[PDB]
Design a protein around this ligand. Structure first.
Ligand SMILES: [Ca+2]
Ligand SMILES: [Ca+2]
Ligand SMILES: [Ca+2]
Ligand SMILES: [Ca+2]
Lengths: 518, 517
């Protein structure tokens, strides 16, 4: 006799008005919101669409979510019916091995995003000719082998199936594509996880795998483009598999063949506001929240969502002092970016709000469906793929204030883990009492001089590239300078005319002490 | 309560007028109330009480207006009188040529429509082809291009992908691309590209779908191609199965019972078709449910006037009771009809005793199978109804916004859509008496206008100079910039051996003295 239009578990009125799940005597109770009681217990005030089995358009009912009768791998924040539960899989390549039909360097992959499937970008180690180390003429062709592992940075787990990925050497130069492995992993890939696990062995990338008798080649021009722009791109799709559903009778999560991720994903993308936020580790985290779509009755059945409330339920912002903030960071320490559509909309709101600064009317900005929003730490500069590649000199400098130990063999400093993410290496030089300068590790591939102690502190080794001897300063009246190189300022390859000196580098003074001071 | 077509909405509501409205937070299918629904900015819906889908498409009248539908269906197809279906054509980004010393040029494609979906690519003419490749009378060139699929319709295709053949000349077919079956686990929604514009395109290698035989091209053929520098891409309508809405949990699952190849024919026989190039200058095709007198079941559909169609199919509105599209009055557009449709409207214009269709617009009845072509009057078009040029005044006005000018070039703010009928610019310097020294004086040295990431056009002088700024012997010498419309651009050397820009139709776009810059 109770109204349950969408036929989940929650009665209409409850969803529209506000509700919450509460355990009393070891038993759960789906109660309506009661400020007296539920506010003190610190439960969450949920609210969903009485006409949508899943407000977020995902394979989990608003009931299964809030109630916990769901696959335990669905991310916490996505237990809220306004937060979408779907997977986000991209490929992480750890290192490459090059050779002619040899060399090997480490590679850092980071997930990317541009204003327009999940794509990741690989950065190959430029520090310590490639063409020489291998013996390459304009007639030879190089082969490619790399180690990779799939990464789920979403809010839902995938099971039976694994995505298709392609390795791209430019704008479209596809070197090899990894087939959509049918069911070669009954093992699960859950949110914030690597397959294969970190403690296990990586996946070997050896050939465009439709016929294992054909390696990944790369003619001399291709190879050179790779050397020129030490970087590959991994474009992964959304060919995830079946969804694991909860059986109300025995509570078993089994991989249902009826529910498939490709039946759902399209709907999610069309009825949610996408927000990407790099507050945790400068990594781009993407979340989707359910927003009203004015021209859609069914989507107007969804609760009204404000930008401020989205940030709280999606990424974890809170107001300890009435002031909104992440982890000790006021919302002002971040930067909002929108596509044209959202841009105009937000502007039209700020218009009808008579407000000039969006940071004040944050709880008054309405999120619609299909909105794309980008929040990123205001301290850093960002590239094409929205990756932290630098910062202001006042920032980078300040990041090296704590000088633990000064030595003629190196420096021991305590550096923010945030800042050290944007540094490419260090440059050491000697400055005579009057004018004379002279770089020691004077190579683009020899900035590789900083080691990270597992006790938080960073160590800068001077004598690394200086023939294993400390600084022989025959005159204790000179200066010892240590500059820093940001990813954006760094050179990864000799210029047009094979120049390999720091002479052409933008550096930031970090440490400048005379000889009698060390 | 009657409901013959059995689609949730009752007979009377559909016949007389209804609207879906959200109350507290629930959808209510309400009978249209003149006063209280109008103020709320709601739309007055009508449909056929005897058609589960008035438009004949695979979505019920009820599903459409209630929002209980694959959210990938176009908004205007949310209205029961606007057909929801896919429109797939192939767009080629660039090709490269060689012999079984390789010319790699960029291409531009436009979906065409003359009196199955088809497009037309144009190969870049800007820097001999037959000589750059040592091609002999008994040689053969191989074709290698990059393409993606475009959905310009109002509904998504899912599993399947259309058969499509590349063609040189009138019927010289160089290659045909298979109709991949269920290999496409991705989605092609309306107004989208496949694959996305941040993933590599699709490769055009083999001439057939199985044999590893490259796309070949004999000598005479390669010449023909060099002479016209354009190819045709014909695509069929073999789309996949259809995504259906499950009321039980709201899941959109691809139904293997319902297939677009069973629906399209119906839509095509029960709708009036309107092509309108207003938005972006491209050919946008829409279908509206129109009455078919000979057909009872079809007479069951709401009467449709031309004026109303434009309102619900494209976005036309009446600010001052005057029909218009985003500022441009309805009078600024062409009306073209196939011989059938023409006669019909000529009749109605007699029974109304009017000679100007622009007046009696709201009294013009649309029937099923009508074909209408509405294009912006300001632009010049070709045989395929593609925007190929403009009136000088329009072209000039589009450049009248100079953000900056110097000796290196111009930084203008040109309409991103207008700049689709300009192949390039001719730069020249003028003597105080009248000498004319053209800087980039070659037919294939016109591509000096790039586009910045902030959407501002920049014309580069240093490009086809000596990579040096523009030097002027006298601050009184005028600096001229001309625009070259597609219709007026040359893609090959002239009769003699002339590659100069002398006989090119140029529109003046800039002309400030040396000291006025
Ligand atoms: Ca319910
Ligand atoms: Ca619900
Ligand atoms: Ca009915
Ligand atoms: Ca009906």
């Amino acid at each position: 006799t109770v109204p349950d239009r969408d036929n989940d578990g929650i009665p209409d009125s409850l969803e529209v008005e506000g509700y919450t799940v509460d355990v009393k005597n070891k038993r759960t109770f789906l109660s309506p919101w009661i400020s007296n009681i539920h506010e003190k217990k610190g439960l969450t005030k949920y609210k969903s669409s009485p006409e949508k089995w899943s407000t977020a358009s995902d394979p989990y009912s608003d009931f299964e979510k809030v109630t916990g009768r769901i696959d335990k791998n669905v991310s916490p924040e996505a237990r809220h019916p306004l937060v979408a539960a779907y997977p986000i899989v991209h490929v992480d390549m750890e290192n490459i091995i090059l050779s002619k039909n040899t060399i090997s360097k480490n590679t850092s992959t980071s997930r990317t995003h541009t204003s327009e499937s999940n794509s990741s970008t690989v950065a190959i180690d430029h520090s310590l000719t490639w063409a020489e180390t291998m013996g390459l003429n304009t007639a030879d062709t190089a082969r490619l082998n790399a180690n990779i592992r799939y990464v789920n940075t979403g809010t839902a787990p995938i099971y039976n199936v694994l995505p298709t990925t392609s390795l791209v050497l430019g704008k479209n130069q596809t070197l090899a594509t990894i087939k959509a492995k049918e069911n070669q992993l009954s093992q699960i890939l859950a949110p914030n996880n690597y397959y294969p696990s970190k403690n296990l062995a990586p996946i070997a990338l050896n050939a465009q795998d439709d016929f294992s008798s054909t390696p990944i080649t790369m003619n001399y021009n291709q190879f050179l483009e790779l050397e020129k722009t030490k970087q590959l791109r991994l474009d992964t799709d959304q060919v995830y598999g079946n969804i694991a559903t909860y059986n109300f009778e025995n509570g078993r999560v089994r991989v249902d063949t009826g529910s498939n991720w490709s039946e759902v994903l399209p709907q999610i993308q069309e009825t949610t506001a996408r927000i990407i936020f790099n507050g945790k580790d400068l990594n781009l985290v993407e979340r989707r929240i359910a927003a009203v779509n004015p021209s859609d009755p069914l989507e107007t059945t969804k609760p009204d969502m404000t930008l401020k409330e989205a940030l709280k339920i999606a990424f974890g912002f809170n107001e300890p002092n009435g002031n909104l903030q992440y982890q000790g960071k006021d919302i002002t320490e971040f930067d909002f970016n929108f596509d044209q559509q959202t841009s105009q909309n937000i502007k039209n709101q700020l218009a009808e709000l008579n407000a000039t600064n969006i940071y004040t009317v944050l709880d008054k900005i309405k999120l619609n469906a299909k909105m794309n929003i980008l929040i990123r730490d205001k301290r850093f500069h960002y590239d094409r793929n929205n990756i932290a590649v630098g910062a202001d000199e006042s920032v980078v400098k300040e990041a090296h204030r704590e000088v633990i130990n000064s030595s003629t063999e190196g420096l021991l400093l305590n550096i923010d883990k945030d800042i050290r993410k944007i540094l490419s290496g260090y440059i050491v030089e000697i400055e005579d009492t009057e004018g004379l300068k002279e770089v020691i590790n004077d190579r683009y591939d020899m900035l590789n001089i900083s080691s990270l102690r597992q006790d938080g502190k960073t160590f800068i080794d001077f004598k690394k590239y200086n023939d294993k001897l400390p600084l022989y300063i025959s005159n204790p009246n000179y200066k010892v300078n240590v500059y820093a190189v940001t990813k954006e300022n760094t050179i990864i390859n000799p210029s047009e005319n094979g120049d390999t000196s720091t002479n052409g580098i933008k550096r930031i003074l970090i440490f400048s002490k005379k000889g009698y001071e060390i």
